[PDB]
Write a protein that binds this ligand. Structure first.
Ligand SMILES: O[C@H](CCCl)c1ccccc1
Length: 162
């Protein structure tokens, strides 16, 4: 297991524009296109991202290219965030994947309310952090996935991903 295999499990792979769990136009391996309810706006974003007129459909290679970019961008983001970086750097490699996964799903601004969980993670108070992480809209709206990510933070193992 690694971050790519982990996010591939959590996000799936679809080659036509679909709506994600929040109802937003998405393609590939969880590549968010736009939060606009206009499908035409989503198609413009897709064409811009791929570099050709896609008409709402991409190839597996194209999906994987967006995925590489999106993972890279999640990490590089974390490292530019003065609140996230020290906690990320304090973690082992497996728990770092949990962090990348959550930021990929939620965005950086998405995790602004996680101040208390962040502190517990840096302190390596793993069971306490896991309890705090679940007190969230995130957990309530996507519990199966959140449970996996939280187990990864709690244990530093891949047990939730078999
Ligand atoms: O997945 C968590 C969310 C904030 Cl507790 C995370 C922890 C450490 C760095 C970046 C994200």
């Amino acid at each position: 297991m690694n971050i790519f295999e982990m996010l591939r499990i959590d996000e799936g792979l679809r080659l036509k524009i679909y709506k994600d769990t929040e109802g937003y136009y998405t393609i590939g391996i969880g590549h968010l296109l736009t939060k606009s309810p206009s499908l035409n706006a989503a198609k413009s974003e897709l064409d811009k991202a791929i570099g050709r007129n896609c008409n709402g459909v991409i190839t597996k290679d194209e999906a994987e290219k967006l995925f590489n970019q999106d993972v890279d961008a999640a990490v590089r983001g974390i490292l530019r965030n003065a609140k996230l970086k020290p906690v990320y750097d304090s973690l082992d490699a497996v728990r770092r994947c949990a962090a990348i996964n959550q930021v990929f799903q939620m965005g950086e601004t998405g995790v602004a309310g996680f101040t208390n969980s962040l502190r517990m993670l840096q302190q390596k108070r793993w069971d306490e952090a896991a309890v705090n992480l679940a007190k969230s809209r995130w957990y309530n709206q996507t519990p199966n996935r959140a449970k996996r990510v939280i187990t990864t933070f709690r244990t530093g193992t891949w047990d939730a991903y078999k």
